[PDB]
Structure formats: structure tokens, C-alpha cells
Amino acid sequence: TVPWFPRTIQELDRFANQILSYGAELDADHPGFKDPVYRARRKQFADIAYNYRHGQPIPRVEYMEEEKKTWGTVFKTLKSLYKTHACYEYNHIFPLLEKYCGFHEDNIPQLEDVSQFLQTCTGFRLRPVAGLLSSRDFLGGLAFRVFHCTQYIRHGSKPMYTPEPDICHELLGHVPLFSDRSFAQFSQEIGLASLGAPDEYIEKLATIYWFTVEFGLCKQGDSIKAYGAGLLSSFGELQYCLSEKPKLLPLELEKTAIQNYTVTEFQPLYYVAESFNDAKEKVRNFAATIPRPFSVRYDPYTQRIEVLD
Template identity: 50%
Template sequence: MELPNRVGILHDVLRFFWKFDVNIRRIESRPSKFGKFDFFVDVERTNGSDEDEKDERLENLLTSLEEYGVEKLLILGEKEVNWFPRHISELDMIANRTLDAGSDLEADHPGFYDQNYRKRRQELADFALNHTWNKPIAEIKYTEDEIHCWTSVWDQMEPLWEKFACTPYLRSLELMKEHCNYTRTTIPQQKDISIFLESTTNFHLRPVAGLLTSRDFLNGLAHRTFFCTQYIRHHSKPLYTPEPDVVHELLGHAPMFADTDFCDFSQEIGLASLGASDEDIDKLARCYWFTVEFGLCKEYDPVKGKDKMTAYGAGLLSSFGELEYACRENENSEKPMIVEWDPKRAALQEFPITTYQPLYFLADSLSDAKNKMRKYCEDLPRPFFAQYNYQTQTVFIDRQIKRLDIEPN
């Protein structure tokens, strides 16, 4: 509806909504021509005991607005948006839409010619494919070769964590040693980790058989759910993996999800992804990459009396070579570019997947990373405002929408 630009006009018009008991969910204003303003008002059609009464109230409202002199009074249809999960149970509809899964490996994968490894990968994939949102995560009995891989990475990473990992990671890792059976010779069960995270930060792990699209993966974060692989890298190269695996997930990601600031930060990206355009999904995925995967933050070093650079990204915290490459202070060695955390720049920054990153973003703190990301998400042209209700495990949105059909797998 179009209204003149004068004091009190909106208040006068809103009186009609109150008069006919029509609940307003969202108001958006935009400057129009000739000093006027266009107002877009979303209303709930939930008052009254039946549909006839609801329609009558809206008809009376529209008639009164026209009689008052409101110009260009148009009834707009529901906003159509890309499909997204409203309730946590709807994650079942996207969890198995993997880009690859089970024994499907690229020819350059270390386990490509190992039929026993491929069979094991398929077995672990089946656990994930059969999981649903209200089931406990199945326990995995890991083999000696798999535990050896875990131990090899743990032994390489442990001294580097002490030097370069952020304090929230180190604090959470100690809690997980106590509550989730994190040891160098035991691969912890995702069920135990998920139960622990739910009790501390309301985050969940959910098994997945392989890589998801950026949209599906980020949509899970909106529900404070992290899609987590269960397979492990090939035992012939325990310190190398061309893809995320259980070592990367549990040593890199999981401890950070015991930190509230980090969880809130991750969920901000997830909520912004709901119903977003493909272009904005790409931007959010790049922000995720440069933070949750490869983020750095400052921490005060009381020994040196100044700030030092620490890692909170899982791609660093599970890779001994790249963690040292990103954080070491050796002036004689090759050093990457370190820039201040800026979501707008990160959203447009391309990155390599199979080599060390040439550029990292450094935040003043995890809280700083979260606040800047929240501001960036607020400035995106989002189709609605989304908020997560922990009690109902449902996403609340502030306007009437129509979700498009979910794309076929």
C-alpha cells in the first residue's frame, strides 16, 4: 500500500488492523515517487474459528483501508522461496542427498584399488543412510587400521594444538577427553559426542554418507546440526585425506561445537542460508570456508605480553602441515597472506581445495567473528527473518511464504 510521507500516517492506518484483529507479522517500507512510501505488510490468517471468519476480517480491513483513502492497495501472494527444512525432522529429506557416498571414490584416492576398504566405506555409509532424526546414532566398531590412522594424526597434532590452537578448542578438548572418551588410541563414538554437545551448547551431530551441497549442509547448521561423516581415510596414508573424514570431523570440528560463541556463529550462517538465492549460498559457503574450516583469531599471550595468532578452523586443527604453515612465525619460511576478518571480502574470495590456502582471515576474537558475520547476514537481501525455537526445534519466520518443491536428488 502507498502512503503519503506525513507524521502519524502509519499509526492511523495500523488502527484498522487492530480494529479487525488482524495480526501483523512484518512491515517493510520503501521510498516511492513524489515523496510517498510503499509499505509491505505481512499478516497472519490464524485468528477466528474458521476460514470464513478469517476471510471476512480481511475483507473488512481492506474495505476500511480503501475508504480511508489508502492508495495502490494490492494483495500480494505468498513469497516463493527455495525449499528449506522448517522442522529438524525435515533434515531427513536432505541428509542422504550426497554428492558422493560409500565406496564411490575418485581414481586418485589412496583406497581406490582396495576392495576391502571400499566395502568398509559402503558399510559405514549404510549406517548414515539408515539414520533418522529421532534415532540414536549407531555405534561403530572401528578396525585396527582405522584406529591406527586416528592415533597417527593425534600424535602429530597434539604438540601443535598446544602451540597454535585457540583456547576454546583446548578447553573443549579436555572436556571431551573426560566425557566423550577422546584418547589417542580410541575413536570416540559420535553418539556420545552428540549427547555431550546437546547438554552444553544445544548442538547435534548427524551422520552423513558423504559430501552434501552447500545449501543442504548450511541448512543443517540453522537447526544447530552438523552433518558428520563416519568413514576414515585409507590406512596407507594416515596423514592425508582428499575429503572430510571422521578424523577431520571429530578432531577438527567437534571440540569447537562445545563453545557457545562458535555455535552461535555457525548457526548465523545456517539461518542466513534458509531460502537464500544460489548466489548468496555461494557467498555464505565461502564465509564458512574461511572461518569454520580455516579461521584464525587473536589471543593474548601473557608470556610474550602481546597478541598471538591461533586457529579455530577445523581444516587447520586436523592438519599438522597446514596448521604450522598458517601459524608459525619463522620469517625465513614461506608465509601465507593474513588479512583482517571481513565477511564481505570472504564472500567473494575464491579458494583452492587440494592445496594449502594462500590467504587466511584473522578475527580479533571468536566473538568478533560472530558479530561481524551476524551484521553481514543482516545486510543480505533475505526473503524473511528466521529464528530458531529450541523447544519446538522449528524455524520461525516473520512472513507468509511458499516453499518451492524440494529439488530431486
């Protein structure tokens, strides 16, 4: 039988409050969680996402000095690294976000403003969530050009890296490429292919997604650049990914798909795509092979899924 999947953009709210985590709460290496004050702060952002409903404007928040300081350190350090570490596509867009989306070190962008901006670029919109969603739900959202985004920020004691998708990751790692026409169409396409697919294919798609969209590397000309959202939001792992420490292998879905990866530490291995474009094509081609007893058609005017066959 086919698992239930959203057919309308409003139906996304059904799983909006089903949050997970990478299981680092009990990690002595990430004391952030244990922080009682930080926990209460996190609870506030969670309540906003829980009470939020489709179509409503994303509530604006006033960040604390510790949080603004963290964003400042993260933003400034990454902007410096992008010049020599980020792929061409990313660097060509980033300037636009800074000028038309308020991306600056002395100001944490409000999701409502970012969402309005994205809508004008590619039709993508933000949907605040309490935290990490399952791969099926996240991918399913992309089918409607909806990016479930967190609003809280990583603990200030370790800005260099966090084993959770905080606002820095969502905005500096994902948002930029979601504002790109081609990447946006690519994203929606894989999301559409995931709707109602068996979990063994969802998890396989998730692993491929992990080694490309999240932590992929690609060569442009005779150099190697990072294009994975997870690398672009971690100045700690961004430095490491192009260093002599990690192991590098050519992108090959057949092998990449069955490869294991870590979710609480820097990746010990990365896959290098022949180019940013080839990465998109490979992932796109694999998603199209995902079997299901039907076909789907998205109507952008009504924002509804049409199940055929």
C-alpha cells in the same frame, strides 16, 4: 521464488542422502579412494547413514586396526601441535572432551556418545551422513543445532591430510567448538539466516565460512593461532598454516568473499582475523545482510521454524 528449506528437524532427512565430494576420486595424489578394500569399508558407513532416520540413536561401529591406528596417529600428533598452534578457545575446551567425552588416542569416539555429550553442552546433536553435503544443506542443519557428521575415517596411508570431511575432521575440527555456548549460538544464527536464501548468497556465505570456520587464523595477543576446523584436524596443514609457506592477509569480508580457494590441497592463502571473537562477529554481521522476502524464528521447544513476513 524461494528455494525449499526444512521447517522441522524431521524434515532434515529429506536431503540427508544427497552426498557430494571435492572431486579427488580420480586424483593420483590420493590413492586412498582407489583402494577396493577401503571402498567396501566406506560403503558400510554409507549404508548406516542412508538407513538412519531422525531421532534414532546413532549406530555404534567396531573400527578396524588400520582405522584405530590412523586415529591414534592423527590424535596424538594434533594434541602435541594444539599446545602451540590452536587458539585459546579451542585449547580450553579440548580437555573437557578428553575427560567427559572419551577423546583419547586409543579409542575412536562413538558418535552416539559424542552427540549425547554435545546435547548437554549446547543442545547440538549429531546426524550421521554418508559424506560431504552441499553448503545449503549443511548450513540449514545448523539452524536446528544439528551437525551432519561423517562416521568413516581417512585412508591410513595419509593421516596428515585428506580432501574430505572424515571422522577426524568432524570430531577434532568441528565438535570442540560446537560444545562452546557462544560458538554454538553463532553457528545456529548463520544457519537460520541461510534458510531459503538465493544460492548466490549461500555460496558467498560458504566462501566466508571456508576462510573462517574452516581455515581461519586469528591473532591472540602478539601471536597467531589457528581456529579453522580444517586446520585443527590436519596435522599436515596445521604445521603449514603457521609456516613461511602460505600467504597471509587481514580478514576483510569484501575481499575474502570473492577470494578463490582449493579443496584438494593445502590452502595457498589464509585470512587472519583480529581475534577469534571479531571473526565470529564479522561473519555474523554478514549473514544478517542476506536478503529474503521473509524472516525466520526458531522455536527450540518444538524444534520448528516459523516463517514471518
